Amino acid sequence: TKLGVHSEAGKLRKVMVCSPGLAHQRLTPSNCDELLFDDVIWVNQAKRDHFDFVTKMRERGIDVLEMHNLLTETIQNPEALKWILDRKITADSVGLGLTSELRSWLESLEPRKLAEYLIGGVAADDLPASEGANILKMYREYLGHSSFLLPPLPNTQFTRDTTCWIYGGVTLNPMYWPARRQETLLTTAIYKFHPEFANAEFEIWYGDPDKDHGSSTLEGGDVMPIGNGVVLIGMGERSSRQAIGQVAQSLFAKGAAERVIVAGLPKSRAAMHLDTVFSFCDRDLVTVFPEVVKEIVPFSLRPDPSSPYGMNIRREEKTFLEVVAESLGLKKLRVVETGREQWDDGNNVVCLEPGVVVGYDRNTYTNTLLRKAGVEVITISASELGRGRGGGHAMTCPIVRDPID
Amino acid sequence: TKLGVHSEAGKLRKVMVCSPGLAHQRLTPSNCDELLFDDVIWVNQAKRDHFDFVTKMRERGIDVLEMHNLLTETIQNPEALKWILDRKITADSVGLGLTSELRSWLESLEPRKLAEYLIGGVAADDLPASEGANILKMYREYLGHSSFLLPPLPNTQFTRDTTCWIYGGVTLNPMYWPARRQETLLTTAIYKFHPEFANAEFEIWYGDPDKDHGSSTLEGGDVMPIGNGVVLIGMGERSSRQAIGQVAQSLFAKGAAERVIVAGLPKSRAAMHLDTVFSFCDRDLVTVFPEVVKEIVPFSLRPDPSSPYGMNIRREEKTFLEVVAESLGLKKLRVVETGGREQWDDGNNVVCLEPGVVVGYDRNTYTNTLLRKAGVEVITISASELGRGRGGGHAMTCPIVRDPID
Amino acid sequence: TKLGVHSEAGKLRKVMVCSPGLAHQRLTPSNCDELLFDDVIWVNQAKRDHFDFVTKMRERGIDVLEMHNLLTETIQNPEALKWILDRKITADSVGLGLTSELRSWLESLEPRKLAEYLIGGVAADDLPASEGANILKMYREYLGHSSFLLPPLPNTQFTRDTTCWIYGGVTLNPMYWPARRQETLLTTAIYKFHPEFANAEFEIWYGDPDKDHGSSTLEGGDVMPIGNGVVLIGMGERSSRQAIGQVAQSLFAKGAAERVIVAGLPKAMHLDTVFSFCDRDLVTVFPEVVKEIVPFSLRPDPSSPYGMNIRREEKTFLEVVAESLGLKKLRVVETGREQWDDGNNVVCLEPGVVVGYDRNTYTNTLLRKAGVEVITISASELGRGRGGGHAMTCPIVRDPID
Amino acid sequence: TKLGVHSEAGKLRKVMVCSPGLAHQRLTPSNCDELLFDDVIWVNQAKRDHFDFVTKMRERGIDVLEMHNLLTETIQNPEALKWILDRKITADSVGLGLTSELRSWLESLEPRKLAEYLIGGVAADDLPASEGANILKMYREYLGHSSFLLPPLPNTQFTRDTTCWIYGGVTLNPMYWPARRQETLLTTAIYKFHPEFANAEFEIWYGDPDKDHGSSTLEGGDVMPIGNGVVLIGMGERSSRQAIGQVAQSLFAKGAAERVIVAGLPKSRMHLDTVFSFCDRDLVTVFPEVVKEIVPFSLRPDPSSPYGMNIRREEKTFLEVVAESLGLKKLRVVETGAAEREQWDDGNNVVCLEPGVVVGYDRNTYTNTLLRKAGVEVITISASELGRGRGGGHAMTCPIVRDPI
Ligand SMILES: NC(=[NH2+])NCCC[C@H](N)C(=O)O
Ligand SMILES: NC(=[NH2+])NCCC[C@H](N)C(=O)O
Ligand SMILES: NC(=[NH2+])NCCC[C@H](N)C(=O)O
Ligand SMILES: NC(=[NH2+])NCCC[C@H](N)C(=O)O
C-alpha cells in the first residue's frame, strides 16, 4: 500500500519507533533536563521495555520500523552517508580543527556503530588521539564545557515528533528546543534514501533540514490527521502559527486537506503537545486532560480563493471536543478524563486498531475506564521509558494507517 | 585615520551607542528576564542618564554615534530599507498573513519613527485595524501568546556585543541568546549603507545575518584587541570555539593579529561576558572579579603555516593575568579587585576614553576610589536604570576608532 | 491623645520607619534573593533617600520614629537588653560554642552600635579573634557555609509588616519567611520597654515572639484598619487563615472591631501592593489582581462555638470596601501610557496628601488629577527591596475620618 | 531488650521502615516538587516493592517493624492518641473553625485507618460535610488554596531521617524542610508509648517535637555510629552546626561516644549517606566529586573547654579520617557516578544486612557488579517507583538494633 496516515484510530499497518540507545547512556543528572528528560534512566531495562513494546505490536501484524536499523541500512549506502555528514559535520557544528578527523573515524566505523553515534552523539574521548580532540577533553574538565562533537539525541525515542505523516504526505519538522533540532536531518535521510521510502509515492508537505526556519516550528505530537480531509494541529508551545500557516497552505494547495482545526493551547513554559492532553482510543472515544482541554480555543482554517494568502481563519464558538465531534460527523465524543486513589494521566495511548490501544501499566484507573468503555488496553512499563515525558503515542510515528468511516 | 580599534586603553575617537527607547517601554515583570533585564526601568530617566553619558564623552572630543540615529539615516536610502525589510519580514518570522500589512505600514512611517519600531519591536495593536491583527490579538487575549510581529530588542543598548572592531575590521556577531540575534541585521545594515561606513576602509573579518552559523556564537563583550598584534577572546559562555576558530582563522590570513589569547571561562548558564569580570582601566591596570578570573584557563592561538587548519593552540601554564601581562611586554598587570570593603562592589565593565580616563557607575565607590588612588580619573554615570540591564560603560560602547597604545 | 490607627487616610501623627543599614551592607548577588531583595543596593545612597522620606514627613508635623533609635534607647535599660539577648542568643541560634563571646562582645559596645548589629546581623569576622570564630570562618572559606552568628534583617526597612496597629492595639506578627521572623522580637522589645510605649495605653490583639505559631503567619502589609469598626486583611499569601481567624476573634472579644473583610488573594505579595488608599474615597489598584480578590465578611455571632460568622461576599472587593465605609463607589486609579508602572503602595500623610516614588510618573499624574498632593522620593535603591512608602511605614497614631 | 545501633556494617537485628501510602496518593505533579519527590509514584506498585524489600529482610532473620503498624498499635492506647492529637491539632495548625470537628472525626475512626490519616494527611473533602469544611473547600475552589487540614508526610517512607539511633540511644530529629517536620511527633509517640519501646532501655540524646529548635536541624541520613565510640555526621545541608554541637555534647556528657567526626558538606541545593556508604567492614561506596570535597573536623570532649568540647580541622582526606578512626590502614573504595562504565549510576545508599551483605537497587548494575567483585552479596529491589522519592535502602531503613563488629 501507498504510504500514508488517514486517521488516529484505524488499523495501523506501518509505524516507526526508536529504541533507547547510546544517547540515553549519555544522560547525566546535570544534563537530563536540558536533554528534555525528568531524570537519568536505566538504559538496559528501557531497551527491554521498548522491545516488549515493539513486540506487542509486531505480533499484531503491524510492521514496526526501528529508527537505528533504518539509519544503519541507510548509511550502508555510500551516497546516503555522504549526504548526512556533508550537512552534519561542519565548521559551525564540530569545529574546523575537528571536522576532518571526526568524519574520518566515523567513515571508518561499521555501519551499525556509525548509526549508533549519529544518534548517541560523539565525545572527544571517542575519537583517536589528536591535539584537537585533547583540548576538548581539557575544556570540559578544566572549565565544564561540552565536549560533544555531535550531541546526544535521546528524544529520537519520540518518533511521534520529528516527522509526521498527513494523509500520504509527511512533514520534516523544525524542532522547537534546539536539543531536538538535529533529529530531522537523520529521519530525513531515511525517507530520502532507504529502500522503504525512496521509490515510494508520497509528498513532502512542509519542512527542510537544510533550510533555517527561525520562528516557524512544528512538532508531530501536535498533528492529527483524523480522517475527513480534516487535520487537527495544536498551537502555541511547540508548534507556531508561522509553521501551521505554511503547512495548512501547502495541504490546501495539493488538496490533501479540506480543513485544519487549530487548537490554541493556553501558554505555559510547561511545553505540552496536543497528544499529551487529548488522545483517541476509538471512533467516538477520547481521553482528555479536562483542566487543559476546556481552555483550548479552536479556530477552523479553510482554503479561500477570495484571500491573497488563499485561506480563511474563523474562530469556533463551541468547544474543542464539540468541534472535533462534528468535524467527524458525531452527535458527541465519549470521554474519559485523566485528572479515585492516586493521580493518573492516561493520555497518549496509541490505537493499533479501532478498539485496541497500547498505554502504560501505571495508569490503572484511566485504563480500567478505557476498558469499561470497550477498549482493549495493552500496557507496557513506563518505569524507564516514561522518564522521557512521553508514552505510546509519543513513541510512534504512523506511516501507514487505514481510514475509518 | 582609518576605522579600527587598536587597544582597550588608547584614545577613543569614535564610539557607537544606542539609547534606551521603545524596546524598553515594552518591558514588563513577566517578560524582562527573558529579555535579559533585571526588572522594568524608568525609561525617561534612563534616557536622561544615557545622554549624560553621551555628553560626558562628547565634551572630550570623542565622536559619539548613536544607533537610532544611524538606523534612521540608513533608512532614508530606499535601498538600505529594502535590504532590511526584505530580511526582517518573512513568512518565517512574521507569518504568511501579516507580512504585507506590516511592511506596508512600516513604509508609511517617517524614518526616525520606523527606526524606533525596528529596534523597539511591533505589537499587534500597533497596526491599523484588520482581521490579521485581530486573529493575532485573540491568540493573546484568550491564549496568552505573544502579539509581537517584530520583537523588541532592548539590549541594542549594549552596542559592545552586537558587533566589534578588531584592529582594522569588524565582526557581525551571531548572538548567543535568541532574544538578541535579530540585533545583528540592524547594525550590519548601517555598516553597509550609512555614509560613515559605506565608503570607509575596513575589513569584515567574520559574520553575516543572512547565514545560520548554528553552534557558532560570538559576542563583542568577549573580545579585546588589547594591541601589540593580539586579541583576547573569552570562551565557553556567550562565545563558542566554533566561532572563535573562524575569527582567529580570518584575522591571521589577512595579518590583522599575530596571536589570540582564548580566555577559557568557567561555565554558568547564568551567561556572563569576559568584560564583566575582567577590565582594562589603564595600559597596565585592570579590574578583576577574583572568584571567576582565577578560574580562567588561558590558551594561545597562533597561526601555523604548516597545519591543515593553519594554526596551533598551546595551552598557557601561567595565570590569565600573567598571560595578558606578558603579551604586552609587561612585567605584571596592576589590579583592583571587584566584588566585595563597606558593601558589595561590582566595579568591572568601565570604559576607557583615553589612557588614564575611564567612565563607570557612581555606586561602585570602592572600586572607584581605588582606580583613583591608582592614578586614574574616573568619570561616573548613574546605574539606577541603565544598570537594571546588566551592563556598564564598556557594555554600552562599541569603539569604531581607538588609537594604538605603545 | 491615645495610641492607635483608625483609618488609612486619616491625619498621620506618629510612625515608625527603619533606614537601610548594616543589614543591607551584607547583601550579595548570592544572598539578596533569599533576603527578599531584587538585588544588592547602594547603601549610603539608600540611606540618603530614606532620610529624604523622613524629613519630607517631619516637615509635615508628623512624629517619625526611627527604629534604630528606639532600639538604641530601649537597650540602654539593662533589663531590656537582657530581655532581648536571652531570647536572641541561644544554642539553637548562635551555637553553644559562641553564645558567651558573642554576648559579652555585644554588651561591650556603645548602645547605638549594638543596635546596628541586632538589626544588621553579625559575622564571624566582626568578632574578636577566637578559635570558635575561626572554625566559623573555616566553614565559610572551605564549604560556603554562612558565617553569620546573627543574621542581617534588611527587611526591618519595611516596618509595615513586622507589626501593625489596629484601632488602639497592636499585633506582634508571626512573619512568613524565615528571613524576617527575627524582626518581631526586636520591635516587641521596643513596644515593651521603650518609654514611648511602656506607659502608653494600648492592647496587644495578637502575637508573641516567644511562641512558635506554626502555620499562623500574619504580615502588616495585609492589614488595614480603614474605619467604621472594620478591618481589611489579605489572605492566602503571607497571612494564613489560622492567623487571621485568631486575630479577628481577639478583636471582637475586646470590642475593637465590628467586621473583618478577609481579602482572598490568588496563587508572594501583600494587600497594600495591589491595593491602597490615596484619599477618603480613592484608591490605587492593580486590576489583574484586585479583580480576582474573593472577599469574605467575618462578623461576631453568639450562634457559633468559635463565636464568628463568615459569609462570602458576592460583589467585588472594591464594592464591599466601598459599602463598608458608606461610600456608594470608590474612585479608582489603575496601575496596569508610556511604560509599565507599579504605583500602588503610596502612604497617605493625611487626606489628600501621599508620598510615593518618583518613577511612577503616570500614576502620580493621574493621582494629581484626582486632587491628591503627591510627594515623591527616590526608588533607585529603596525600591529594590520591593517596597514603597506604605511598606516602609508603620503608623502608630492616625486619626479616623467620618 | 537492649536497643542501640553500634555500627553501620554489623548484624542488623531490628529496623523500622515505613511503607508508601495515603501520603503518596496525594502526590500530584504540582505538589511533588515541595513534597521532596521527583514525581508522582505508582502507589500500589510501590507498595508491592516495599513489601519485597521488607520480606527480603525478614527472610533473613531481621526484625522488621512497619511504621503504620506501630502507629496503629500506639493509637489504640487512649493516652498516646491524646498525646498526639493535643499537639497535632491546634488552632495554629488546623484553624479555630475546624479543630473540634477534625478531632471528633478522627477519634471516631478505626485505629489502623486513623494512623493512615495521621501519616497520609487529611483533606477538607475527607471530613463529613460541614459549614467549616465547605469554607475551606471554597478557599480552594475560588482561590486555589491548599485544603489540607493535616499534611501528607510521604517522606515518612524514609525512616532513616526522622529519627536515628546512635549507640544506646536515639535522637528525635528537628527536620530541615518544613515538609518533613511533622514526622517527628509521630515517631516520638511511637517510641514513647508503644510496648516495644516504652519499656525497653535506651537514652534520648537530643530532640523534642515539643520544642522549636530554630536553626538547629538534624537528620538521620547524616548520622553514622560506625563503631569505636566514633560517630560521623555530615554538616551544612540538612544538619546544622548548632544541632550537631548539642548532640556531640549530650553523647560526650553521658559517655556514649569518644569522638564525633563532622563531615563538612560543600554548599547546597543531600545527606551524607547519599554520597558515602559502608558495604563491609572496610568497604565504602563513594561519590568522588562530592566526597573529594568533604572537609572533616574532629570534635572530642574537653574539660578545659567552658562548653566541654574542642573541634579541629583535618588535612587528611575524609576517607583517611574515617579509615584512621576505624583503625584501618585505608578503606577499600568503590566509586559511583571513571572506570569503563556504560551509563550514569548511583549505587550509594545501599544498606547492610550484616558484614558482606547489602540491599541496593537493581538499576545500579555497574556498582553492584564492583561490589560483588569486592566480595559483597548484593540483594536488589526495584527503584522504578520507590526511588522517585530520592532515596535507597539506607534511606528507607532506621536501624534500631545493629550489633557492632
Ligand atoms: N508527542 C509527545 N507527547 N511527545 C513527548 C516528547 C517528550 C520529549 N522529552 C520532548 O521534550 O520532546
Ligand atoms: N559586554 C557586556 N557586558 N554586555 C552586557 C549585556 C547585558 C544584556 N542584558 C545581555 O544579557 O545581553
Ligand atoms: N507591605 C509591604 N508591601 N511590604 C513589603 C516588604 C518587602 C520585603 N522584601 C519582603 O519581601 O517582605
Ligand atoms: N537519608 C536519606 N538519604 N534520605 C533521603 C531523603 C529523600 C526525601 N525525598 C527527602 O528529600 O527528604
Side-chain angles (χ1 to χ4, degrees), chain A residues 36 155 158 160-161 180 221 238 273 275-276 348 388-390 394:
Chain A
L36 301 160
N155 316 274
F158 301 121
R160 168 64 47 162
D161 303 319
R180 301 194 61 167
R238 298 299 186 107
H273 301 81
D275 69 359
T276 295
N348 222 248
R389 318 168 176 179

Side-chain angles (χ1 to χ4, degrees), chain C residues 44-272:
Chain C
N44 297 315
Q45 191 46 50
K47 294 214 294 185
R48 292 186 276 273
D49 300 4
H50 188 78
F51 192 45
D52 178 53
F53 181 38
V54 172
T55 305
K56 277 179 182 146
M57 223 138 18
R58 292 181 174 137
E59 258 220 317
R60 268 44 158 54
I62 310 180
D63 191 13
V64 181
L65 290 174
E66 158 67 43
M67 194 176 173
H68 280 85
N69 293 348
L70 290 191
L71 209 259
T72 299
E73 295 170 7
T74 297
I75 66 172
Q76 275 186 33
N77 166 330
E79 219 180 336
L81 213 209
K82 181 168 182 270
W83 190 85
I84 295 178
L85 294 196
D86 284 347
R87 287 163 182 70
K88 188 166 189 67
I89 301 169
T90 66
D92 291 324
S93 70
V94 164
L96 35 64
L98 289 99
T99 53
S100 308
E101 47 182 286
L102 185 258
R103 191 151 177 184
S104 65
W105 178 65
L106 284 176
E107 291 164 345
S108 90
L109 312 171
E110 218 33 64
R112 197 161 286 286
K113 290 184 297 163
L114 222 174
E116 288 170 32
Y117 284 126
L118 295 175
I119 299 175
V122 173
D125 318 61
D126 301 308
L127 278 175
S130 78
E131 291 168 317
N134 288 340
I135 59 159
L136 231 280
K137 288 177 61 209
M138 240 147 49
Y139 296 159
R140 171 188 60 64
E141 184 69 73
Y142 295 85
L143 307 152
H145 299 180
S146 157
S147 73
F148 298 139
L149 295 293
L150 251 40
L153 312 163
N155 296 280
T156 48
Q157 173 182 335
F158 304 106
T159 52
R160 170 69 54 174
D161 314 317
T162 141
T163 66
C164 52
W165 292 71
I166 315 155
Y167 306 124
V170 71
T171 56
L172 317 168
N173 303 319
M175 307 276 62
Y176 183 83
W177 285 125
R180 306 199 49 171
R181 298 193 180 188
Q182 310 289 242
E183 292 163 33
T184 318
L185 186 86
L186 288 202
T187 306
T188 278
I190 291 166
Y191 290 155
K192 184 176 177 73
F193 299 107
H194 187 103
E196 287 258 12
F197 303 97
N199 316 291
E201 51 219 305
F202 64 78
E203 215 71 359
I204 290 179
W205 303 129
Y206 175 76
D208 191 295
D210 291 331
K211 184 170 167 293
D212 171 57
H213 298 271
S215 287
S216 287
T217 58
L218 203 257
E219 305 220 325
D222 288 319
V223 173
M224 289 183 104
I226 62 180
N228 269 49
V230 179
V231 177
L232 299 199
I233 309 179
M235 163 207 308
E237 297 267 279
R238 303 278 279 232
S239 303
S240 59
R241 61 181 166 81
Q242 295 96 310
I244 300 170
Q246 310 175 72
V247 178
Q249 188 162 70
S250 182
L251 286 161
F252 296 163
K254 247 93 108 221
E258 304 187 343
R259 198 228 291 208
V260 167
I261 300 165
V262 173
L265 303 158
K267 137 177 174 58
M269 46 178 128
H270 309 77
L271 187 62
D272 65 359

Side-chain angles (χ1 to χ4, degrees), chain B residues 159-174:
Chain B
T159 45
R160 177 128 247 137
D161 316 312
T162 306
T163 65
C164 49
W165 293 71
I166 306 177
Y167 294 111
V170 71
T171 64
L172 321 191
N173 308 335

Side-chain angles (χ1 to χ4, degrees), chain C residues 92-94 216 241 246, chain D residues 92-94 241-242 246 265:
Chain C
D92 291 324
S93 70
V94 164
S216 287
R241 61 181 166 81
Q246 310 175 72
Chain D
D92 287 326
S93 59
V94 170
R241 80 193 162 63
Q242 30 275 82
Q246 291 180 82
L265 293 168

